Amino acid sequence: KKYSIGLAIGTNSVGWAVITDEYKVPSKKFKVLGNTDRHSIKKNLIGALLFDSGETAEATRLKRTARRRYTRRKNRICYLQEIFSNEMAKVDDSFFHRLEESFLVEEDKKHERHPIFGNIVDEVAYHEKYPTIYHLRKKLVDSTDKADLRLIYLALAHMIKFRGHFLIEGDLNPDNSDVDKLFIQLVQTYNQLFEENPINASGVDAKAILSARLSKSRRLENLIAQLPGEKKNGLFGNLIALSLGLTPNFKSNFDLAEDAKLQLSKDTYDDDLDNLLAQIGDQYADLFLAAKNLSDAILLSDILRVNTEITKAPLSASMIKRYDEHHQDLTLLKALVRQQLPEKYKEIFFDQSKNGYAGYIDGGASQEEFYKFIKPILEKMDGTEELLVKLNREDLLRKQRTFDNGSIPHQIHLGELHAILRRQEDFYPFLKDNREKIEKILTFRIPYYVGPLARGNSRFAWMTRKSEETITPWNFEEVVDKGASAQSFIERMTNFDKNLPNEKVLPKHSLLYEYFTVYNELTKVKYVTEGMRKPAFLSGEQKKAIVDLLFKTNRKVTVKQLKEDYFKKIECFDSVEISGVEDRFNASLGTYHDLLKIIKDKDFLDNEENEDILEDIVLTLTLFEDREMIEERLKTYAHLFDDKVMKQLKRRRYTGWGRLSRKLINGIRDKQSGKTILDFLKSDGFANRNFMQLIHDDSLTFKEDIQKAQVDSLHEHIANLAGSPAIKKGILQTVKVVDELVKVMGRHKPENIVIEMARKNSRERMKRIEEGIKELGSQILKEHPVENTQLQNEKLYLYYLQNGRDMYVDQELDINRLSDYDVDAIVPQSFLKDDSIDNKVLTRSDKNRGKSDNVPSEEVVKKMKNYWRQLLNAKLITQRKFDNLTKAERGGLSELDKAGFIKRQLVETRQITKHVAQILDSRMNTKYDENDKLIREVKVITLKSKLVSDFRKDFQFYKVREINNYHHAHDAYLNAVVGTALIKKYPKLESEFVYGDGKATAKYFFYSNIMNFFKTEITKRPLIETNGETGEIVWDKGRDFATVRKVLSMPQVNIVKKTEVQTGGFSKESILPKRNSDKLIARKKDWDPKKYGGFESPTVAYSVLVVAKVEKGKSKKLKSVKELLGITIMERSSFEKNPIDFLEAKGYKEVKKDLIIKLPKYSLFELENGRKRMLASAGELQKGNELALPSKYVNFLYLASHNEQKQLFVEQHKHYLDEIIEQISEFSKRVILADANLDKVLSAYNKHRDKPIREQAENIIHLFTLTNLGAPAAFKYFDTTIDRKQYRSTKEVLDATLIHQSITGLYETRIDLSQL
RNA sequence: AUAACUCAAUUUGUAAAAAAGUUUUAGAGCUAGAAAUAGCAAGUUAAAAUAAGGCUAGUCCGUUAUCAACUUGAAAAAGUG
DNA sequence: CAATCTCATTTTTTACAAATTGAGTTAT
DNA sequence: AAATGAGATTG
Ligand SMILES: [K+]
Ligand SMILES: [K+]
Ligand SMILES: [K+]
Ligand SMILES: [K+]
Ligand SMILES: [K+]
Ligand SMILES: [K+]
Ligand SMILES: [K+]
Ligand SMILES: [K+]
Ligand SMILES: [K+]
Ligand SMILES: [K+]
Ligand SMILES: [Mg+2]
Ligand SMILES: [Mg+2]
């Protein structure tokens, strides 16, 4: 009747337990339903729910967005064919028909098999003339002869079907012609500005060096290499870098203490440059114009590779170039191999599986695997010297459709499209009339802020229609309301003001919002001088002066400025003490200065009659990021500023939204005062009151006005939490588990509920170092190349994050010496349990940090500080890591800070865990007392994993996860015991552990020793522990430790695997070649995979038991069957719509509809000798038994795998090994039934008896994946690998016992499937 | 424990785009020889599909979340030891 | 039939909002 | 980025 619940919440598991007064877990009889022998069964109230991980919405999103791209790319083609339809009907009757049936085999085609012209002779002639589609592109662009309308279409459709990216705004007009003159012009102006010293043009071939196919870095090096007395870091070097598209830094050139780095493709270039030019003088302007002018002709040299005077199609020409070089070097490679390597010619040019040229063209061999495979052959032969040059440039034998085309801007494909239309519109009138439309098909792009063009049936769409019409690319601006749509894009996601829920939050950069932040900070600033007795607030007149003089002149306001530029200058204090702010004010009037630079009118920003306009301008600048719409929205104010000011305001853009509403900060008014919140922050007289105070002061009316403005389900609520969907899945299951236990306990609520919650990309790592190293100017990657997969090594990863340098000592490290170095916790592990890179460092020896009990010492901080700064700016360390490193210069860890960490080790602060406790508390405590305050009948306790974990080590209740899943349940039992014991012993700690509403050393010691009441001797305490005030019993060393052992020793624990209908993709995505088989699924209704190939390995949503008849033999005599049919995800909707018809089509007859049993994945069946199986599929099974190993063996394995008194227990009881093997064998021979594997285990074990007991025990732990629950898996015992033994027949299940389990497993209905 | 602000890191969710990959077909293979089979010539490109499909017919929707059994329900979830 | 081997779509860009953690300032 | 449900091939 009196019980508490323990809960262990994980991403894949929820353990649960029920305990009584004396920490015993009850044992109850439960009714068994079904048609079986048993009418009931006894179960212990300890168990654990297992389940597959909850997934994010990401993959579904990526598939959904890809979906929409494919359909819109198709609509592009359709739009184009609709423009061509009438005039093509006169040239070729069925052209567009042959194109769309091009995929069909000749047997299924309506028209002749050759798509373009419809006859061998003309089709063979076409490929002779245009071996690639780019041969046709170029000719159609450059030639002036009338072209076949079918060839015009193909050219435009190819350009429209693959249009390139949209990452560059505006238009490009390739000009590769003037690089030599433009470079000479840059060197020219530079030498005009630096007359003391010039650069020499020197006939340097800039075109070749800068247009060569290397990275921008190399082309820079080669360029300055040809310049004597110059360096790549020097001014001219950093200019060449910018002209190449790089981001250089110019501060060290001009003696600037402020970083000046420019990127010509970044939208902030013009203003960044303005800052630089305002600092260094505008006589340097022409120097950057030359860099930009050279940048325009060199921009796309990466892709063009051709002079733009021969053609208007430098891309296609570049493509044709790839082809011709592929041709020559292929002829040349063939000859060579014949002469010098004839015996290898077959492998290279014929065998499709070898990654040769045949594998390259006809196989699945990528450019990289081809090059890798043919690298030795070339450098082995002679006469191949230039092919190796082409290979290192990745230019050897190149296709035209390649992974690296992603750099091509759509503006290029547009150029060629435009040219083709210009030539042939002379001959075809309709191409003239529709020249606009066609270009628009390639050009148009749904703006990301419009979203899907739905009509009321899209859960993802927000866009609004300016008129009810079909949206096309040509009527988009007129039919779609872009302004209202761009608004909803933001507003459907923005927060309302929690204080005023009917009001939108202000932009973060709103002038009003920043006045609020400055005053709210200023109003609690206090000051003292010599004369005065107390520190005093700032008055109204003082703040206004501080704002007008400092905040409206300085971007940031330092305390030094406050003391010198206000207190000294205006109040004549040689010295003053400031409280309430440190070093400088956090708040600032940034937008005030942003606009001051643009509108150059200070009296405009200070004029209060402009407040509304300025607030609407900054709202516009935040809501919209499309500068074409910003301009349209600022037009109304175009009369208040000149043209150039509006131009600048266009580009001013903000992001972010505040926490509060305009009405809250200003709108609302105090009835007595008539002042708004901001009025009080400006002037409140003597008491200078916070926003917090203003909102909670019962003397003012703000609180009541707010309070009267305020205003679901378990599943929606949990889904709306912030956190991993995986952990949310466990949260929901935890509530459902508790509901059932309460019901099991007769609807009596627990006394306590104790809950505990548990806590990979190499590409990101490689990206981190590449960026930081590049930003750091270090050669460590050229000197010590790396591969992402290597960086999963902890020490190697740090080594590169620290630029191959000791983090504490200022000396190099040796990659070959990592094993001799130390990983060290910045803030010692004994305080903060932090495993991440943020708290870790690689140093030669951990002794050099300093004292072990603290942050790295002052000495080290001094020596290394500047070096950590560089790592910070290179983003190789985070601010968190940096601030921790330096803390010693702030006194290191104070005694208070230490005590803080130790209690954070046992007291849970995580928000997600607090939500779990609040959910439980609100479901358990629903009643209110006579004073209308909540009655807390159930106390919800939350514990960190450390308490039970330490409890296990201390008292040797050891845990080994690999043996079975019982530990999930044991942890929950131990949570309830410990959690109830603590609150029973220290009822004052209710505030810390229970949900609801000099000394530092004592705090440290106290929390550090909190768990000693369990022990008899601490390095003494009575055998019977009790609480002081009540005298009640909490812990009894005599009987209670034994009860825990009895519980952890129980063989029967309810480990339930949640059955789940499988969802997601229909099958694997790969499209297999045609095959004579019924395994392949058609990719389209009429595409028989025997002809067209298709998908394999469909996914079973659930299995169904069918008992029915099937026809057999020539005569179709009916045989009675009972079998498992897998319903695939794709078939499921049809099956549930009409189950009989579905099964009848499948061949089953006279189906017994009332015996149809739906069997999701992991359905449980028992067989002979308690042997169990779980349904993995319609044709596979998983292991359904848990092996309960005696505690004595579990504790042994733990101690053997890893004081003198426990080492002796290992040797004394060494015979346990053979007994553990015995235990596994009987289990295996009884439930696993893998005969061969069990031998190789017994054989592989017999052979390593000679090995140490440690290693032997370490690998016996491996042996348990043979007996573990669920899917079989391979494992290694020393160097012997055991292959997994799958169970790929489900026949035996059909006569076994089906077990339907409730969430706890306590309620079962068992069906004996001996029915026919 | 809460609230606003500062700096930073992380996580979740959404939209708009790009390049490949795959699959069938089209790129008249040629001499020999009855036949397999040999010898050589070739290869780089394109079309089309890219969850089967759905009705609400939109340039929309189709892979997340949620699911023991029985009784009740569209469903959520409730009722049953 | 088992045993044994084999295989699994990938990558890139832009724009945006909300939590949460954790070092700070001020407050209820 | 596994791992785990199948496919084909073998014994
Ligand atoms: K035909
Ligand atoms: K290939
Ligand atoms: K291709
Ligand atoms: K500060
Ligand atoms: K914006
Ligand atoms: K004007
Ligand atoms: K699901
Ligand atoms: K799934
Ligand atoms: K994101
Ligand atoms: K279940
Ligand atoms: Mg489709
Ligand atoms: Mg392709």
Side-chain angles (χ1 to χ4, degrees), chain A residues 494-507:
Chain A
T494 45
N495 269 333
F496 290 90
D497 185 334
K498 285 196 201 67
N499 306 121
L500 273 25
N502 264 298
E503 302 281 9
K504 306 140 144 187
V505 153
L506 273 169

PDB file of all heavy atoms in Angstrom, chain A residues 494-507:
ATOM      1  N   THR A 494       8.069  33.780 -34.783  1.00  0.00           N
ATOM      2  CA  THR A 494       8.516  34.719 -33.760  1.00  0.00           C
ATOM      3  C   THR A 494       7.692  34.596 -32.487  1.00  0.00           C
ATOM      4  O   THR A 494       6.519  34.217 -32.508  1.00  0.00           O
ATOM      5  CB  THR A 494       8.436  36.168 -34.241  1.00  0.00           C
ATOM      6  OG1 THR A 494       7.182  36.393 -34.895  1.00  0.00           O
ATOM      7  CG2 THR A 494       9.590  36.493 -35.167  1.00  0.00           C
ATOM      8  N   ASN A 495       8.315  34.964 -31.375  1.00  0.00           N
ATOM      9  CA  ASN A 495       7.658  34.914 -30.081  1.00  0.00           C
ATOM     10  C   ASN A 495       6.781  36.135 -29.863  1.00  0.00           C
ATOM     11  O   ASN A 495       7.128  37.252 -30.259  1.00  0.00           O
ATOM     12  CB  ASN A 495       8.694  34.845 -28.964  1.00  0.00           C
ATOM     13  CG  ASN A 495       9.038  33.433 -28.580  1.00  0.00           C
ATOM     14  OD1 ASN A 495       8.235  32.516 -28.744  1.00  0.00           O
ATOM     15  ND2 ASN A 495      10.241  33.248 -28.056  1.00  0.00           N
ATOM     16  N   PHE A 496       5.641  35.911 -29.220  1.00  0.00           N
ATOM     17  CA  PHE A 496       4.874  36.997 -28.639  1.00  0.00           C
ATOM     18  C   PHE A 496       5.418  37.314 -27.251  1.00  0.00           C
ATOM     19  O   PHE A 496       6.162  36.530 -26.653  1.00  0.00           O
ATOM     20  CB  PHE A 496       3.392  36.630 -28.559  1.00  0.00           C
ATOM     21  CG  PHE A 496       2.715  36.565 -29.893  1.00  0.00           C
ATOM     22  CD1 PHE A 496       2.685  35.382 -30.614  1.00  0.00           C
ATOM     23  CD2 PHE A 496       2.110  37.687 -30.428  1.00  0.00           C
ATOM     24  CE1 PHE A 496       2.064  35.322 -31.842  1.00  0.00           C
ATOM     25  CE2 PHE A 496       1.488  37.634 -31.653  1.00  0.00           C
ATOM     26  CZ  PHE A 496       1.462  36.450 -32.364  1.00  0.00           C
ATOM     27  N   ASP A 497       5.046  38.486 -26.743  1.00  0.00           N
ATOM     28  CA  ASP A 497       5.491  38.925 -25.425  1.00  0.00           C
ATOM     29  C   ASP A 497       4.778  38.116 -24.347  1.00  0.00           C
ATOM     30  O   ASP A 497       3.550  38.169 -24.235  1.00  0.00           O
ATOM     31  CB  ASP A 497       5.213  40.418 -25.260  1.00  0.00           C
ATOM     32  CG  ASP A 497       5.756  40.990 -23.957  1.00  0.00           C
ATOM     33  OD1 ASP A 497       5.909  40.244 -22.965  1.00  0.00           O
ATOM     34  OD2 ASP A 497       6.023  42.209 -23.927  1.00  0.00           O
ATOM     35  N   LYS A 498       5.542  37.360 -23.555  1.00  0.00           N
ATOM     36  CA  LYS A 498       4.923  36.534 -22.522  1.00  0.00           C
ATOM     37  C   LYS A 498       4.141  37.376 -21.523  1.00  0.00           C
ATOM     38  O   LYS A 498       3.113  36.927 -21.004  1.00  0.00           O
ATOM     39  CB  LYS A 498       5.980  35.706 -21.797  1.00  0.00           C
ATOM     40  CG  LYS A 498       6.498  34.531 -22.600  1.00  0.00           C
ATOM     41  CD  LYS A 498       7.230  33.541 -21.711  1.00  0.00           C
ATOM     42  CE  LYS A 498       8.166  32.651 -22.509  1.00  0.00           C
ATOM     43  NZ  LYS A 498       9.299  33.423 -23.093  1.00  0.00           N
ATOM     44  N   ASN A 499       4.611  38.591 -21.233  1.00  0.00           N
ATOM     45  CA  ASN A 499       3.867  39.480 -20.347  1.00  0.00           C
ATOM     46  C   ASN A 499       2.582  39.970 -21.004  1.00  0.00           C
ATOM     47  O   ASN A 499       1.557  40.130 -20.333  1.00  0.00           O
ATOM     48  CB  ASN A 499       4.744  40.664 -19.945  1.00  0.00           C
ATOM     49  CG  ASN A 499       6.063  40.230 -19.342  1.00  0.00           C
ATOM     50  OD1 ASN A 499       7.131  40.574 -19.848  1.00  0.00           O
ATOM     51  ND2 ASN A 499       5.997  39.470 -18.256  1.00  0.00           N
ATOM     52  N   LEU A 500       2.621  40.221 -22.311  1.00  0.00           N
ATOM     53  CA  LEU A 500       1.464  40.661 -23.089  1.00  0.00           C
ATOM     54  C   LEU A 500       1.319  39.704 -24.267  1.00  0.00           C
ATOM     55  O   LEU A 500       1.772  39.997 -25.383  1.00  0.00           O
ATOM     56  CB  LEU A 500       1.637  42.106 -23.556  1.00  0.00           C
ATOM     57  CG  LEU A 500       1.193  43.255 -22.644  1.00  0.00           C
ATOM     58  CD1 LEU A 500       1.176  42.872 -21.176  1.00  0.00           C
ATOM     59  CD2 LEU A 500       2.106  44.448 -22.863  1.00  0.00           C
ATOM     60  N   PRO A 501       0.701  38.540 -24.051  1.00  0.00           N
ATOM     61  CA  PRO A 501       0.747  37.484 -25.077  1.00  0.00           C
ATOM     62  C   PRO A 501       0.116  37.858 -26.408  1.00  0.00           C
ATOM     63  O   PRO A 501       0.357  37.159 -27.402  1.00  0.00           O
ATOM     64  CB  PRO A 501      -0.005  36.326 -24.410  1.00  0.00           C
ATOM     65  CG  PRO A 501       0.134  36.572 -22.959  1.00  0.00           C
ATOM     66  CD  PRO A 501       0.088  38.058 -22.801  1.00  0.00           C
ATOM     67  N   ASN A 502      -0.680  38.921 -26.475  1.00  0.00           N
ATOM     68  CA  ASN A 502      -1.292  39.340 -27.730  1.00  0.00           C
ATOM     69  C   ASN A 502      -0.417  40.299 -28.525  1.00  0.00           C
ATOM     70  O   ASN A 502      -0.885  40.861 -29.522  1.00  0.00           O
ATOM     71  CB  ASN A 502      -2.650  39.998 -27.466  1.00  0.00           C
ATOM     72  CG  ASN A 502      -3.803  39.033 -27.613  1.00  0.00           C
ATOM     73  OD1 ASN A 502      -4.041  38.492 -28.694  1.00  0.00           O
ATOM     74  ND2 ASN A 502      -4.539  38.822 -26.530  1.00  0.00           N
ATOM     75  N   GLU A 503       0.834  40.495 -28.122  1.00  0.00           N
ATOM     76  CA  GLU A 503       1.695  41.503 -28.724  1.00  0.00           C
ATOM     77  C   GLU A 503       2.969  40.859 -29.250  1.00  0.00           C
ATOM     78  O   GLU A 503       3.557  39.989 -28.597  1.00  0.00           O
ATOM     79  CB  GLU A 503       2.045  42.601 -27.716  1.00  0.00           C
ATOM     80  CG  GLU A 503       0.836  43.316 -27.129  1.00  0.00           C
ATOM     81  CD  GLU A 503       0.258  44.361 -28.063  1.00  0.00           C
ATOM     82  OE1 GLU A 503       0.682  44.415 -29.237  1.00  0.00           O
ATOM     83  OE2 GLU A 503      -0.618  45.135 -27.618  1.00  0.00           O
ATOM     84  N   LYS A 504       3.390  41.291 -30.431  1.00  0.00           N
ATOM     85  CA  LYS A 504       4.623  40.793 -31.015  1.00  0.00           C
ATOM     86  C   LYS A 504       5.826  41.417 -30.324  1.00  0.00           C
ATOM     87  O   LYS A 504       5.773  42.546 -29.826  1.00  0.00           O
ATOM     88  CB  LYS A 504       4.687  41.104 -32.509  1.00  0.00           C
ATOM     89  CG  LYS A 504       3.491  40.627 -33.321  1.00  0.00           C
ATOM     90  CD  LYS A 504       3.111  41.665 -34.371  1.00  0.00           C
ATOM     91  CE  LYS A 504       2.621  41.026 -35.654  1.00  0.00           C
ATOM     92  NZ  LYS A 504       2.426  42.048 -36.717  1.00  0.00           N
ATOM     93  N   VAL A 505       6.921  40.664 -30.307  1.00  0.00           N
ATOM     94  CA  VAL A 505       8.171  41.156 -29.750  1.00  0.00           C
ATOM     95  C   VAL A 505       8.817  42.149 -30.713  1.00  0.00           C
ATOM     96  O   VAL A 505       8.661  42.061 -31.938  1.00  0.00           O
ATOM     97  CB  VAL A 505       9.093  39.959 -29.450  1.00  0.00           C
ATOM     98  CG1 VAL A 505      10.554  40.344 -29.507  1.00  0.00           C
ATOM     99  CG2 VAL A 505       8.746  39.368 -28.086  1.00  0.00           C
ATOM    100  N   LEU A 506       9.555  43.108 -30.151  1.00  0.00           N
ATOM    101  CA  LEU A 506      10.257  44.104 -30.947  1.00  0.00           C
ATOM    102  C   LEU A 506      11.499  43.507 -31.598  1.00  0.00           C
ATOM    103  O   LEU A 506      12.055  42.520 -31.114  1.00  0.00           O
ATOM    104  CB  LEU A 506      10.675  45.282 -30.074  1.00  0.00           C
ATOM    105  CG  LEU A 506       9.675  46.417 -29.862  1.00  0.00           C
ATOM    106  CD1 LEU A 506      10.162  47.351 -28.767  1.00  0.00           C
ATOM    107  CD2 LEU A 506       9.457  47.187 -31.154  1.00  0.00           C
ATOM    108  N   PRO A 507      11.958  44.092 -32.702  1.00  0.00           N
ATOM    109  CA  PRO A 507      13.273  43.711 -33.229  1.00  0.00           C
ATOM    110  C   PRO A 507      14.353  43.942 -32.184  1.00  0.00           C
ATOM    111  O   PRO A 507      14.291  44.893 -31.403  1.00  0.00           O
ATOM    112  CB  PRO A 507      13.452  44.632 -34.440  1.00  0.00           C
ATOM    113  CG  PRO A 507      12.082  45.040 -34.820  1.00  0.00           C
ATOM    114  CD  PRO A 507      11.287  45.083 -33.556  1.00  0.00           C
TER     115      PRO A 507
END
